[PDB]
Amino acid sequence: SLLPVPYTEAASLSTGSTVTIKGRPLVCFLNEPYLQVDFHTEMKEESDIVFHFQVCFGRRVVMNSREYGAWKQQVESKNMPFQDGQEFELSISVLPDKYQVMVNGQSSYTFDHRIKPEAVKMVQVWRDISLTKFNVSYLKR
Numbered sequence: 001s002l003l004p005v006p007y008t009e010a011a012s013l014s015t016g017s018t019v020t021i022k023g024r025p026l027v028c029f030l031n032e033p034y035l036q037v038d039f040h041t042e043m044k045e046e047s048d049i050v051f052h053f054q055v056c057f058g059r060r061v062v063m064n065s066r067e068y069g070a071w072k073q074q075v076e077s078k079n080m081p082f083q084d085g086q087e088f089e090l091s092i093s094v095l096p097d098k099y100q101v102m103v104n105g106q107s108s109y110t111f112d113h114r115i116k117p118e119a120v121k122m123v124q125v126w127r128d129i130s131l132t133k134f135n136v137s138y139l140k141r
Ligand SMILES: CCN1C(=O)C=CC1=O
Pocket: 027, 028, 029, 084, 085, 086
């Protein structure tokens, strides 16, 4: 809807930062839509990825990093709090030791830092969703 997808926004993250995304799947879970959020080290899409979050709605969630052009060890979770045909609010918080991902207010996934959050310069949100809101909190030093 409101925001274009793929959506790209230059960003800076540090401990205490929060990335909030509000959106909705474009098709029924039965047709398996995806959602992907990538934290890049450069403004270019072929750059390394500090945190890659991919949701196969109704199936699994996969998380990884791409360092020096190579994907590393994948982490998969079968935890699936997303609701079929519903709007969702995804919140990603930067803790000192890891990212904590909340879905509609409930802790659902965590991912220990492999590269310092300070290396992030861009965030891209894409795949089968409409995006109504995207916000990065620049509250802390
Ligand atoms: C929850 C029922 N539903 C779907 O499965 C896709 C759109 C919708 O409203």
